[PDB]
């Protein structure tokens, strides 16, 4: 009935769309201008007044100033309708025009595609109150990551240093990534996830660069929350033995540490270090001057298991009444990820029973199956 009505009406829509296409006719082929008009004569004229090249300014020698510019053609130029002389900066991207080469427009700095898309400006879809079994850990993380930011005058009155650096560690799967996502979503600051694999490249020179540009980007931004993951992958025991050929990763780790805290302030950057094997981590990095508030995620207790159970039960089609504390009791030594998989198994059991209700019986069957496997 309803399904057939759907099929009919969607057939009508497909027919309408093809009819529109054939009747009027809009396509691109190779390049196109489908949006009507788009006349851009003034655009051409101002492009001629512009369409400038860019390079990297080097030095402003004199106090009319002498800007020095380097690309496939060196140059020494200055002056422009632009003001804020060299925007009080030298190593920018100048953006200078042709035709006597003295008119400029400042540009941001070039950055490799890797970091460009590692910026990860997206907001993960997680929020607090969806976390159970690690109330103490989340309390610690909330304190460290928010008190310096949210009404932090109370945090400065006491004359106490602001902690900077937290390493999340624990068994594989405890809601560490979940809590990282939640903090990312809630926070309002330059957030930057980092993947360890992207820091391993073809021979020396790559990781150290990308790390340095990442760090200067964070410094340029007002306040950064960096989110290293795969720290187990990036940075390990400094010992060489046979790693005399593999010293590249160790080198990159060394530069990472130096930028974290070397002979220069590191800045308003708070670091999150995701891991599950917090022993091979190098001592220099693990130094508490760089990872202040290491947090440990443990297997949830009964209350945490129940809270995670109801959280996952947030979904609909579930039974009207379930007895979650017994569910948790039946699943001891179970990760929150295992609670999630138990809810998934209950849903799949409902489907394989052709039932639109997820019953406590379905939950019990799922628990039995997961326990047996």
């Amino acid at each position: 009935t309803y399904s057939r009505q759907i099929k009919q009406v969607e057939d009508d829509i497909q027919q309408l769309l093809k009819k529109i296409n054939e009747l009027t006719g809009i396509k691109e082929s190779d390049t196109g201008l489908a949006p009507p008009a788009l006349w851009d004569l003034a655009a051409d004229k101002q492009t001629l007044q512009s369409e400038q090249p860019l390079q990297v300014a080097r030095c402003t020698k004199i106090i009319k100033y002498i800007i020095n510019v380097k690309q496939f053609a060196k140059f020494v130029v200055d002056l422009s309708d632009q003001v804020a002389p060299t925007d009080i900066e030298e190593g920018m991207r100048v953006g200078v025009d042709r035709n006597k080469y003295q008119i400029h427009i400042p540009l941001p700095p070039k950055i490799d595609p890797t970091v460009t898309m590692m910026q990860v400006e997206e907001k993960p879809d997680v929020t607090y109150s969806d976390v159970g079994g690690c109330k103490e850990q989340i309390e610690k993380l909330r304190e460290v990551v928010e008190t310096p930011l949210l009404h932090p005058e109370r945090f400065v009155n006491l004359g106490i240093e602001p902690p900077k650096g937290v390493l999340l560690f624990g068994p594989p799967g405890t809601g560490k990534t979940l809590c990282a996502r939640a903090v990312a979503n809630r926070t309002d600051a330059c957030f930057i996830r980092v993947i360890g694999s992207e820091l391993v490249q073809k021979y020396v020179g790559e990781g150290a660069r990308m790390v340095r540009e990442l760090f200067e980007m964070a410094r340029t931004k007002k306040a950064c929350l960096i989110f290293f993951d795969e720290i187990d992958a990036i940075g390990g025991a400094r010992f060489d033995d046979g790693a005399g050929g593999d010293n590249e990763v160790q080198r990159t780790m060394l530069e990472l540490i130096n930028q974290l805290d070397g002979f220069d302030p590191r800045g308003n950057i708070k670091v999150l270090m995701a891991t599950n094997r917090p022993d091979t981590l190098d001592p220099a990095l693990m130094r508490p001057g760089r990872l202040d508030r290491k947090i440990e995620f443990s297997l949830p207790d009964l209350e945490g298991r129940t809270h995670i159970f109801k959280i996952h039960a947030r979904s609909m089609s579930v039974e009207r009444d379930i007895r979650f504390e017994l569910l948790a009791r039946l699943c001891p030594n179970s990760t929150g990820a295992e609670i999630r998989s138990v809810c998934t198994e209950a849903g799949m059991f409902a489907i394989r029973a052709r039932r639109k209700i997820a019953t406590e019986k379905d939950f019990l069957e799922a628990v039995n199956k997961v326990i047996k496997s």
Binding site: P35, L38, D188, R314, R352, K356
Partner: protein, 829 residues
């Protein structure tokens, strides 16, 4: 092939069926019990081609034969069980649904859920095919509905139950089954009635929803649906209960914000505070308090709102004054106020008229104290244009401001009868817009007698009609209709096709806005008015009369009337504007109405081309999406000056009170490009002003309450402005340009002060994110997209909602907006 176990199971089932030819020993009760056992097995098993079925095809006919064979008794329904299952799989559209279900009432344990689904479908379609007859066979349908609804409510299929009820016209049935768990689901489902097929017949959906809400004591949203149903009597009845002080104050806040005028005196508890809440006396103080929180009380020079550094006739002087008034909304410009006041006072020239005084009125909008005081101490004297400026400033200050005191009404009634035609026009405009939507009768009785404007100008007649239309705001006031009729009698052959003639149609449509079936009498009066006229404004009459409809019968009528080519295209313009004025709600419908309007602009006459951008603004008011901005810029750089005017103002409107950086950059680039066009530069300046309305604190919006509530006064003002801009060249680029002030009166904010009990500004952390259309999705959908915890003093956005926090407080409303209260009673921390 088949498996041996299978083939044996069938063989046994058939052999049973053939031996079934009469009632005897195992034949009737035990053999049919065997069959029902296999049916129970089939339902319990998978939807995987149950073995008993798909092989007993002639056996369906044989079971029918056995049914008509055995005499009545214990049989005739226990076999009807088997017959009805074989029907569902094969046949028996209604016969089985009737007799088998008359047997074994409900209790569909041995049948599963698909059985229940298809019986529901068959019953609904049987009711559909049964016209207003078959009462004897309809009572069984009522019993069927009673049987089916509670099981559906239990299982999970409340959406299917809602379907059943809608297509069976059983709105007032579930009132006895709704539960404390499913009330939200059913209420949301009822609210989601964009087809509202019953509504043109009658608001049965709203009726049952309001019954449920009053039964469950959810007064806020009960009142929301009460307003949705245009019956002030019903709204008053809902508000009457007043069993809780907190909820009473909350619903008073909603009534005041919507501007619906309550009626009572010193006769009930909390009468004074409820009256103040509804009157909105505290709105200005609360707005100023929020501004102080993150103080924004900094006057900005027109260029500062612009960025002229990045690179003075009446025209640009007034344009800059308008920009300043838009950006500084109720912020008390004070020093910059006086500076620009002296500037435009010196620049008083041609159109350097009361306009700028009304601008000061906007800067002091809702500032009854500051605005009235400032205008009184520095205004009036000579220059009847300056006195009209004072009158309109008072009107603006009082716009949407309710109070028994009549600071605007008294003055404008005093100076209504002054001979000066333009000053009287301004006075009447101020009077209308000061209490636009109040719907009272004092000013109507004071104005309708002076509707007769044979001694005055037709523009005065039209603007007075618009004032009465503001007041009536859809009341279909018979007095308004009568005075419009005498105006038509006073009408002239040529005055219609000169300018401003649309105002009288505009006022009639205001009086009869989206009434419903009264649009029939509206068209009757349209045919009654047989003036020597080129229709068109009659089309506007009908258009502004019918509105708020998600269906497209009037939409197709208007589309075809415009489609007939007019090789007098203002008729098509009003037709497209009416298409917009019908499609304003449903998001997909609005998007695709914009697509259709783009089709119109591309394959349309220049008249339709000038018309389209206004309709685009109507659809996307204060909703500057990238695609719509691209289109509006595209057709604002058009060669035709009128097209460019319409598109530039439409883009300013879609950017209204948003301050989007991309929009502002595009705006300034377009201003640079149109460097030699004075009127275009004026309009672009007003466009920046719109982009910066109250520095992005006040946003006019027809829709409201999570895209649920219709703003009657807002639609009135917006439609006035857009009708005025239908012909920008003559209507605006000339004498009259104060319909923008009408829009200003129509203005309103978007803001989330959590002023708790006793208006205490209790702060709270609120997670805000773009809406997600909670309907249908899994569990309790995360309405918040991109959680941005930002305390209480937030501004939300065109389409984002809030979720507060875990359990800190209990809001009195789940549609958080404007003035709200947060009960400090968490169940447990």
């Amino acid at each position: 092939e088949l498996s041996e176990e299978d083939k044996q199971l069938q063989d046994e089932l058939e052999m049973l069926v053939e031996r079934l030819g009469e009632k005897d020993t195992s034949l009737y009760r035990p053999a049919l019990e065997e069959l029902r056992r296999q049916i129970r097995s089939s339902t319990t098993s998978m939807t995987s081609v149950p073995k008993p079925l798909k092989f007993l095809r002639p056996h369906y006919g044989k079971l029918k034969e056995i049914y008509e064979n055995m005499a009545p008794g214990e049989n005739k329904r226990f076999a009807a069980d088997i017959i009805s299952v074989l029907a569902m799989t094969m046949s028996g559209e209604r016969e089985c649904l009737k007799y088998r279900l008359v047997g074994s009432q409900e209790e569909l344990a041995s049948w599963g859920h698909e059985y229940v689904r298809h019986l529901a479908g068959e019953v609904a379609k049987e009711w559909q095919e049964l016209d207003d007859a078959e009462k004897v066979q309809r009572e069984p349908l009522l019993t069927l509905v009673k049987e089916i609804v509670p099981y559906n409510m239990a299982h999970n299929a409340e959406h299917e139950a809602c379907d059943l009820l809608m297509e069976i016209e059983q709105v007032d049935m579930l009132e006895k089954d709704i539960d404390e768990n499913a009330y939200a689901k059913v209420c949301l489902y009822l609210t989601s009635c964009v087809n509202y097929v019953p509504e043109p017949e009658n608001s049965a959906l709203l009726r049952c929803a309001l019954g449920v809400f009053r039964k469950f004591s959810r007064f806020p949203e009960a009142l929301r649906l009460a307003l949705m149903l245009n019956d002030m009597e019903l709204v008053e009845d809902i508000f009457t209960s007043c069993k809780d002080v907190v909820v009473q104050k909350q619903m008073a806040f909603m009534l005041g914000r919507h501007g619906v005028f309550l009626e009572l005196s010193e006769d009930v508890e909390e009468y004074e505070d409820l009256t103040e809440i509804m009157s909105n006396v505290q709105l200005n103080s609360n707005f100023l308090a929020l501004a102080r929180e993150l103080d924004i009380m900094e006057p900005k020079v027109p260029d500062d709102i612009y960025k002229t550094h990045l690179e003075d006739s009446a025209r640009m002087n007034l344009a800059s004054s308008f920009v300043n008034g838009f950006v500084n909304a109720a912020f008390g410009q004070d020093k910059l106020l006086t500076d620009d006041g002296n500037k435009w006072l010196y620049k008083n020239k041609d159109h350097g008229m009361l306009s700028a005084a009304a601008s000061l009125g906007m800067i002091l909008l809702w500032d009854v104290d500051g605005g009235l005081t400032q205008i009184d101490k520095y205004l009036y004297s000579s220059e009847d244009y300056i006195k009209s400026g004072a009158l309109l400033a008072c009107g603006i200050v009082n716009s949407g401001v309710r109070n028994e005191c009549d600071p605007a009404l008294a003055l404008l009634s005093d100076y209504v009868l002054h001979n000066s035609n333009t000053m009287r026009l301004g006075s009447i405009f101020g009077l209308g817009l000061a209490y636009a939507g109040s719907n009272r009768e004092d000013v109507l009785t004071l104005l309708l007698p002076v509707m007769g404007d044979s001694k005055s100008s037709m523009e005065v007649a039209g603007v007075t009609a618009l004032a009465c239309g503001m007041i009536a705001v859809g009341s279909c006031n018979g007095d308004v209709t009568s005075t419009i009729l005498q105006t038509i009698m006073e009408k002239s052959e040529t005055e219609l096709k000169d300018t401003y003639a649309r105002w009288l149609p505009l006022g009639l449509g205001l009086n009869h806005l989206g009434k419903g079936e009264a649009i029939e009498a509206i068209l009757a009066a349209l045919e009654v008015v047989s003036e020597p006229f080129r229709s068109f404004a009659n089309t506007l009459v009908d258009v502004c009369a019918y509105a708020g409809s998600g269906n497209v019968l009037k939409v197709q009528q208007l589309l075809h009337i415009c489609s007939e080519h007019f090789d007098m295209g203002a008729h098509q313009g009003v037709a497209v504007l009416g298409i917009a004025l019908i499609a304003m709600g449903e998001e997909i419908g609005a998007e695709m109405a914009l697509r259709t309007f783009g089709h119109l602009l591309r394959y349309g006459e220049p008249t339709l081309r000038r018309a389209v951008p206004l309709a685009l603004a109507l659809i996307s008011v204060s909703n500057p999406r990238l695609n719509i901005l691209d289109t509006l810029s595209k057709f604002s750089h058009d060669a035709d000056p009128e097209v460019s005017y319409n598109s530039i103002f439409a883009m300013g409107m879609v950017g209204s009170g948003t301050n989007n950086a991309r929009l502002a950059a595009m705006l300034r680039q377009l201003a640079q490009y149109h460097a030699k066009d004075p009127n275009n530069l004026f309009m672009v300046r007003l466009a920046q002003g719109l982009t910066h309305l109250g520095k992005g604190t006040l946003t006019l919006c027809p829709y409201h309450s999570d895209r649920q509530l219709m703003s009657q006064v807002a639609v009135a003002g917006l439609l006035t402005v857009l009708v005025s801009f239908l012909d920008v060249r003559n209507i605006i680029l000339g004498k009259s340009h104060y319909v923008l002030y009408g829009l200003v009166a129509a203005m309103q904010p978007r803001m989330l002060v959590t002023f708790d009990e006793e208006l205490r500004p209790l702060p709270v952390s609120v997670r805000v994110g773009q809406a997600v259309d909670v309907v249908g999705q899994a569990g309790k959908p995360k309405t918040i997209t991109g959680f941005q915890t930002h305390t209480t003093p937030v501004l939300l956005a065109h389409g984002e909602r809030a979720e507060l926090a875990t359990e800190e407080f209990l809001p009195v409303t789940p549609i958080l907006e404007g003035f709200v209260i947060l009960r400090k009673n968490p169940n447990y921390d």
